[PDB]
Structure 1
Amino acid sequence: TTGRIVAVIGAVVDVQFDEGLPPILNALEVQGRETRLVLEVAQHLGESTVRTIAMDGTEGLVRGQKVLDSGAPIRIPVGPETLGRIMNVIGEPIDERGPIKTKQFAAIHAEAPEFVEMSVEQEILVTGIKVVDLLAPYAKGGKIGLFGGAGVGKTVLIMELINNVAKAHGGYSVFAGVGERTREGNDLYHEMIESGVINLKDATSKVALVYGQMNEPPGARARVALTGLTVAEYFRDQEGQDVLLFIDNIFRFTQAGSEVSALLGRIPSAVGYQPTLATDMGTMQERITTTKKGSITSVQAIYVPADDLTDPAPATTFAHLDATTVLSRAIAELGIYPAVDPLDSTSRIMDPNIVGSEHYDVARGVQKILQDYKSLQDIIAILGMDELSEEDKLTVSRARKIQRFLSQPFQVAEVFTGHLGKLVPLKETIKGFQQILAGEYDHLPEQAFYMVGPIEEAVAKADKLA
């Protein structure tokens, strides 16, 4: 079927398909649009005319310019060969090594897993990173939201995570560059290239990069969310995967939703927000989960919008957040890479009755200790150490050991660290803390807890010294 430009007002193209009534979300390809000018059917206005949203820019728009309905949503390559390919949203490379070369294609909406599909009570994904595991132990399938230090090697940390896990457990990754600067995607690009977690000669390119950047029309960016999902579902179900799904920064996606909302003639809402904000999300989130198919585990860069949250979206997001990451400058400032703050590396599912107090209390003891120590840190800040009880002194040192024990070298940043990285097996980590907690090593170099992997290696590191 063909459609006609009946109206173009910016990237809202109302196309009268002059003979078609393809449902909404049916992807249209505009004919005479060399560059894949996808219009997504948006409303059936009547009159065989649909409001479509151009998802590619508008130009040269002949009145009645011809459009051929692609009749279903965008079908996109889905297949492992994407790992090592940067596509735009449309699933066209932007890695430009000709096309990406799956055969298994998918229309870019996927649907929620349902009750019957569930795997009813979730599971921690473990990274082997002390901070992660301890403080916000991840859930496989879980959507974790990254508030976090900019350019601190946030991404790097993420690479490291990918490294630790997606390698470890055979998870793969999808990166949805939402609202990314070309620059930032670049940054990543080389970071991955460099890291060799994208390998343009190896399938150790473990990440398909899908980009839905600012510079696109809204629709694309908006939809990049569905798209990214669609890939991971491919990996999930098909490749059985526990996927790590980076959608970064989903916020801008959201923005895009709202942007269009207006321009979908719709009322968005107060604070600009599309009133459907939640459903959009809900529906999106509900695709993302854990099932009898694996998990799509979501590592989501999440901007603190307007550094406020009052603004409904994050507020909603909180539901959609389940384990929470604020990556923290303080920690960073302490030179500690890991730079995470524990009191933020939390999980709404991190609750003792709801996960466990082994984390929660060993942590509470720890978090206590550090904070308590923080309470002392102000005291000490005035007084020095002297005055305290020795137990406090001990605890300070311990807190500090523990702290130091969180400093963990990077494999993916020998360039920064001058070290290999490390990983820490959770039991051993914890055990570690039991030791320090037990005070066991508090007669040892505290700074031997600095930058190590196993707590044993902190211990080891102490020894060579004394």
Structure 2
Amino acid sequence: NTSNMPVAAREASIYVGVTIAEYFRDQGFSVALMADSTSRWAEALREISSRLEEMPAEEGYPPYLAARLAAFYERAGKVITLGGEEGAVTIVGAVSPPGGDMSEPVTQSTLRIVGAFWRLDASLAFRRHFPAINWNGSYSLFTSALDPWYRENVAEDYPELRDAISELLQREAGLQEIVQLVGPDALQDAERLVIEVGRIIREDFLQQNAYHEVDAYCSMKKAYGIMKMILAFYKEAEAAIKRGVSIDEILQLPVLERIGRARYVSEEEFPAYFEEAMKEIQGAFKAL
């Protein structure tokens, strides 16, 4: 969908694609429909509408857009094709507001339809945290829908682990807001530990390197194993603090640097870090 092409063609492009997508799912294939983007499709449509003298509304967009855009996304889904067999069309649509405003067209109407939103965050990117997906502003509507697949095929504690990590990240967010006011000097050891582990979650888990030959893809089996290394370090961290272990002693714990490079390991040598973590804390229970 180039600029020299009529607004008409770009408008029809998502419909031509979705139809081709539905065609392949009919065979019993799972197809992905990636739409660069609908902001530009709504601008091409607004050009056609204004030329037809249809009444402009908000940002001069025609009234008809919301029902249409919704109708598009409704054609997505996993079905039982004609003559049995299952196939599906998953849609990933790009959102490009006129400029950060994140209102109309694109964003506003889209975020109301779609069930999932992965918010690339320019500040997360500048900070070199990849993928640059904001774990606080992104959302999905399927956690409970897919938890049993993970529990049965990958790990029995998938849901409990992600809920626990999210509560960690949630707590960090609240703590950082307060610190923004009263500074970090008054922070108790318990709160410093939560920030320490919260930071490890962000750097060792949330951040992924798309450019690394290994971390470019993280198999399900590897995802849970890294999660349990982090969550196990958390429990041990809170347990050590409760026994008056200096947080400074935990912060420079040797295993931490290994946990930081775990995303780069392509072998289960990663779950070995759990035992390496426990003994190391014991060496910290020894020195007291």
Q: TM-score, normalised by structure 2?
A: 0.70
Q: Distance in 2 between matches of 1:234 and 1:373?
A: 50
Q: Is the 8 A contact 1:398 1:439 kept in 2?
A: no
Q: Distance in 2 between matches of 1:371 and 1:402?
A: 13
Q: Corresponding residue for 2:218?
A: 423
Q: Corresponding residue for 2:209?
A: 409
Q: Corresponding residue for 1:289?
A: 77
Match among 169, 176, 191 for residue 374 of structure 1: 176
Q: Distance in 1 between matches of 2:275 and 2:216?
A: 18
Letter in 1 for 2:3: M
**Secondary structure in 1 aligned to 2:35?**
strand
Does residue 336 of structure 1 match 2:129? yes
Letter in 1 for 2:209: P
Q: Is the 8 A contact 2:204 2:262 kept in 1?
A: yes
Aligned pairs for 1:241-280 (under 5 A) are: 241-280=29-68
**Secondary structure in 2 aligned to 1:325?**
coil
Which structure has greater helix proportion? 2
Alignment length, in residue pairs?
243
Q: Is the 8 A contact 1:366 1:399 kept in 2?
A: yes
Q: Is the 8 A contact 2:229 2:273 kept in 1?
A: no
Q: Distance in 2 between matches of 1:334 and 1:237?
A: 44
Aligned pairs for 1:97-136 (under 5 A) are: none
**Structure 1 pair 254/427, CA: closer, same or farther in 2 (3 Å)?**
same
Letter in 2 for 1:452: A
**Structure 1 pair 337/275, CA: closer, same or farther in 2 (3 Å)?**
same
Q: Distance in 2 between matches of 1:373 and 1:458?
A: 30
Give the gaps of 5 or more residues in structure 2. Answer: 81-85, 148-158, 239-249, 281-288
Q: Corresponding residue for 2:285?
A: none
**Structure 1 pair 451/277, CA: closer, same or farther in 2 (3 Å)?**
farther
Q: Is the 8 A contact 1:288 1:297 kept in 2?
A: yes
Letter in 1 for 2:232: Q
Q: Write the deviation string for residues 60-80 of structure 1: whole angstroms up to 9, x where unpaired.
A: xxxxxxxxxxxxxxxxxxxxx
Q: Distance in 1 between matches of 2:208 and 2:102?
A: 32
Q: How much identity, in percent, do the aligned residues show?
A: 22
Q: Distance in 2 between matches of 1:255 and 1:281?
A: 13
Q: Corresponding residue for 1:300?
A: 93
Q: Distance in 1 between matches of 2:44 and 2:189?
A: 56
Q: Write the deviation string for residues 39-91 of structure 1: whole angstroms up to 9, x where unpaired.
A: xxxxxxxxxxxxxxxxxxxxxxxxxxxxxxxxxxxxxxxxxxxxxxxxxxxxx
Q: Distance in 2 between matches of 1:445 and 1:305?
A: 46
**Secondary structure in 1 aligned to 2:34?**
strand
**Structure 1 pair 314/428, CA: closer, same or farther in 2 (3 Å)?**
same
Letter in 1 for 2:198: A
Question: Greater CA deviation, 241-250 or 452-461?
Answer: 452-461
Match among 358, 361, 367 for residue 163 of structure 2: 361
Q: Is the 8 A contact 2:79 2:88 kept in 1?
A: yes
Does residue 452 of structure 1 match 2:262? yes
Q: Is the 8 A contact 1:445 1:462 kept in 2?
A: no
**Secondary structure in 2 aligned to 1:326?**
coil
Match among 222, 228, 232 for residue 435 of structure 1: 232
Q: Is the 8 A contact 1:400 1:446 kept in 2?
A: no
Q: TM-score, normalised by structure 1?
A: 0.45
Give the gaps of 5 or more residues in structure 1. Answer: 1-211
Question: How far is 1:399 from its partner?
Answer: 0.8
Aligned pairs for 1:5-84 (under 5 A) are: none
Q: Write the deviation string for residues 193-232 of structure 1: whole angstroms up to 9, x where unpaired.
A: xxxxxxxxxxxxxxxxxxx122211111111111121221
**Structure 1 pair 285/230, CA: closer, same or farther in 2 (3 Å)?**
same
**Secondary structure in 2 aligned to 1:438?**
helix
Q: Distance in 1 between matches of 2:39 and 2:90?
A: 18
**Structure 1 pair 391/245, CA: closer, same or farther in 2 (3 Å)?**
same
Q: Write the deviation string for residues 235-292 of structure 1: whole angstroms up to 9, x where unpaired.
A: 2222x23222211122111111111111233234332212110121122111122322
**Secondary structure in 2 aligned to 1:295?**
strand
Q: Is the 8 A contact 2:73 2:91 kept in 1?
A: no
Q: Distance in 1 between matches of 2:25 and 2:161?
A: 28
**Secondary structure in 1 aligned to 2:52?**
coil
**Secondary structure in 1 aligned to 2:262?**
coil
Q: Distance in 1 between matches of 2:26 and 2:132?
A: 34
Question: How far is 1:362 from its partner?
Answer: 2.3
**Secondary structure in 2 aligned to 1:346?**
coil
Letter in 1 for 2:270: E
Letter in 2 for 1:336: H
Q: Distance in 2 between matches of 1:304 and 1:447?
A: 40
CA RMSD of aligned residues (A): 3.5
**Secondary structure in 2 aligned to 1:245?**
strand
Q: Distance in 2 between matches of 1:458 and 1:328?
A: 31
Letter in 2 for 1:450: G
Question: How far is 1:463 from its partner?
Answer: 6.3
Q: Is the 8 A contact 2:161 2:231 kept in 1?
A: no
Does residue 224 of structure 1 match 2:13? yes
Q: Corresponding residue for 2:138?
A: 345
Q: Write the deviation string for residues 351-404 of structure 1: whole angstroms up to 9, x where unpaired.
A: 87x888747732441222331342365368x445xx422112211110111112
